[PDB]
């Protein structure tokens, strides 16, 4: 109930909507990679998915003012990862389709996958610190 941690619950509630939205996003990239989905459609689904991502991003910004300066920093870093995680996810699918499996192009995927794997691991640590009121 108190206004301090009530606002943190809404931030955690928005992260649920963001995590679910990437699942709809990721499933759309795989649908185009497996050639089950044309390039034209995937572009409009990302348009639909990034809109909900844009709503969640703006909702969490509104929740920042009532938070402590240590908590506003954790949110600031949280959105930086989620912004880079969005672009690194869509950019990864396109590079996997055009790549001729040459070693130069082949390690772009591994570097981005390692980036995505580390970004996701960093995000959960930001949430757990927010859960512990860091």
From Swiss-Prot:
Cytoplasm found in the keyword field: yes
An individual GO BP term: subtelomeric heterochromatin formation
Stored InterPro entries: REX1-B (IPR039491)
Keywords: Cytoplasm, Nucleus
Intracellular or extracellular location(s): Cytoplasm; Nucleus
Tagged with keyword Nucleus: yes
Tree of life domain: Eukaryota
Assigned GO CC terms: chromosome, telomeric region; cytosol; nucleus
Description of how the protein assembles with itself and partners: Monomer.
Role noted for this protein: Required for heterochromatin silencing within pericentromeric repeats and at telomers. Facilitates the recruitment of Clr6 histone deacetylase (HDAC) by interacting with histones. Also interacts with Rad25, which mediates heterochromatin silencing in DNA repeats by recruiting the RITS complex. Together with Rad25, forms a regulatory hub that defines heterochromatin silencing within tandem repeats via linking RNAi and HDAC.
The protein's name in its UniProt record: Heterochromatin silencing protein rss1
Source organism: Schizosaccharomyces pombe (strain 972 / ATCC 24843) (Fission yeast)
Gene: rss1
